[PDB]
Amino acid sequence: TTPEDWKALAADVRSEFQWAWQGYVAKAWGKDEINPVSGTSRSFFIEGHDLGLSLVEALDTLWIMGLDAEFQAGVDWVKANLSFDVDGNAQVFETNIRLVGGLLSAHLASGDPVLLAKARDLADRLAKAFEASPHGLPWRYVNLRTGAVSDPETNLAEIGTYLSEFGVLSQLTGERKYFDMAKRAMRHTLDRRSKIGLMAANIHAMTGAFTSRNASIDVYADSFYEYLWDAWALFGDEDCKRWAVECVDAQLAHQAKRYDGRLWFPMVDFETGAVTGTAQSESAAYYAGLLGQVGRKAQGDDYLASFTYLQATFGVIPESIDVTTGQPRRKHTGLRPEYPDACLNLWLIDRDPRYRRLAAIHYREMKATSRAAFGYTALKDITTRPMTQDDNCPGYWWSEQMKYYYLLFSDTPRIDYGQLQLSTEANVLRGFRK
Numbered sequence: 038t039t040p041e042d043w044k045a046l047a048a049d050v051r052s053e054f055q056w057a058w059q060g061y062v063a064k065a066w067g068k069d070e071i072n073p074v075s076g077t078s079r080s081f082f083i084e085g086h087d088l089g090l091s092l093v094e095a096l097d098t099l100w101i102m103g104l105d106a107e108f109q110a111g112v113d114w115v116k117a118n119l120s121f122d123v124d125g126n127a128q129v130f131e132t133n134i135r136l137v138g139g140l141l142s143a144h145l146a147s148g149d150p151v152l153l154a155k156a157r158d159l160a161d162r163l164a165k166a167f168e169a170s171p172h173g174l175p176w177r178y179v180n181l182r183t184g185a186v187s188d189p190e191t192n193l194a195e196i197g198t199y200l201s202e203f204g205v206l207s208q209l210t211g212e213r214k215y216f217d218m219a220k221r222a223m224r225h226t227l228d229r230r231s232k233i234g235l236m237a238a239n240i241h242a243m244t245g246a247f248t249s250r251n252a253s254i255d256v257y258a259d260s261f262y263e264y265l266w267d268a269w270a271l272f273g274d275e276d277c278k279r280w281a282v283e284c285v286d287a288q289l290a291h292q293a294k295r296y297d298g299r300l301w302f303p304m305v306d307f308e309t310g311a312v313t314g315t316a317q318s319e320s321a322a323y324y325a326g327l328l329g330q331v332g333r334k335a336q337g338d339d340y341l342a343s344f345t346y347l348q349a350t351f352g353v354i355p356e357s358i359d360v361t362t363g364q365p366r367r368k369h370t371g372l373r374p375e376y377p378d379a380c381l382n383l384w385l386i387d388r389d390p391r392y393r394r395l396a397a398i399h400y401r402e403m404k405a406t407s408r409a410a411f412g413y414t415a416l417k418d419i420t421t422r423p424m425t426q427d428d429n430c431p432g433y434w435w436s437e438q439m440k441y442y443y444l445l446f447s448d449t450p451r452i453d454y455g456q457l458q459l460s461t462e463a464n465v466l467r468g469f470r471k
């Protein structure tokens with residue numbers, strides 16, 4: 038057997054990323070997303086008022102890969118062109134994790150003050166969504182120019198995925214208000230945990246009350262649980278360290294369920310642990326890595342194995358599965374990053390080469406299924422051979438899985454792997470070595 042040449046595989050990831058970037062420059066320059074089958078662009082936040090989403094998402098990946106000319110071309114576009122004084126509604130959660138976080142990682146890589154100025158300007162526009170709630174729970178949408186808010190029927194992910202970006206803003210700016218605003222919203226829902234330690238995933242920004250009874254690790258909730266741990270790691274916050282482990286141990290006690298010998302975390306009633314759903318999202322795979330981070334690595338490996346089963350059986354992990362049968366519930370995909378997310382997070386603990394093996398399967402399968410004329414695309418149908426394609430490269434592809442693969446394979450000297458911290462959008466918030 039020829040041992041894998043990990044440096045060669047990293048160089049292939051870089052080559053493919055640079056090739057994809059060239060397609061973006063050719064077909065979608067300054068636009069939010071490329072449609073790489075048609076060779077066109079689409080808007081993400083505001084129809085017809087693109088904000089360079091994929092360009093911004095790509096920046097820290099480009100830098101980490103040593104694609105310096107490409108990085109600088111993107112940074113220079115941002116500095117000349119990007120602004121947020123726009124009379125249109127933006128989804129607060131998406132805007133923070135993609136644009137605030139993408140500008141912050143680019144700022145930390147480069148030192149360029151303008152990138153921080155723009156991140157902070159955008160955060161100040163998002164802050165109006167928090168200020169519009171007497172509980173500090175952000176409304177889901179805000180008008181970037183006027184501050185007008187819409188839709189208070191929100192969820193843990195959309196109230197609780199700010200503290201990393203906002204806390205880094207507080208560190209860099211010296212203004213504590215960003216950290217405090219993000220932490221306050223998380224504390225609100227944690228103070229409403231049931232006696233079994235769970236939160237329902239759906240919450241109202243104005244009443245402050247839960248609007249469902251369903252505890253979740255995936256839809257409506259995922260990154261809330263990450264950002265508790267990540268705030269301990271990034272800021273030393275004692276409360277978040279406590280909360281992170283309490284929340285995960287409640288989930289292990291009441292949501293961990295085995296079906297056909299495999300670990301899943303279906304939805305349960307947040308006050309009884311009784312099962313209220315049978316679906317698991319592909320996107321739940323982040324949790325395997327979080328389990329390892331919080332000191333539950335055997336459980337994290339067991340959960341990873343459930344997704345390794347889906348990859349081995351279906352090639353591409355189905356977008357959703359029925360835990361009771363282990364079979365797909367959907368045939369389309371979102372070109373999703375969570376399996377290599379988990380592999381990188383678990384690999385950062387002891388550098389076990391098994392995680393590299395598994396992530397290499399995932400990268401090669403992405404190449405075999407999602408490659409299109411001008412980049413990489415989400416899929417229409419994973420059950421046909423070949424798998425049929427839809428026509429969209431999601432913005433998160435630019436920040437997430439190509440970075441994950443590259444960090445797993447490259448051992449790049451541009452990252453201090455002991456200090457590396459990643460947001461839920463894979464924006465690097467600590468660990469650059471200039």
Ligand SMILES: O=S1(=O)N[C@@H]2[C@@H](O)[C@@H](O)[C@H](O)[C@@H](CO)[C@H]2O1
Pocket residue numbers: 134259260320371373374375433461462
């Ligand atoms: O399942 S999600 O709703 N939560 C994920 C975020 O944490 C980011 O990783 C990224 O924007 C997408 C990756 O699939 C999100 O899809």
Ligand SMILES: [Ca+2]
Pocket residue numbers: 260323461462
């Ligand atoms: Ca994520």
Ligand SMILES: [Ca+2]
Pocket residue numbers: 263326327382459460461
């Ligand atoms: Ca994480």
Ligand code: NA
Pocket residue numbers: 093094095096097098138139142435436463464465
């Ligand atoms: Na990024």
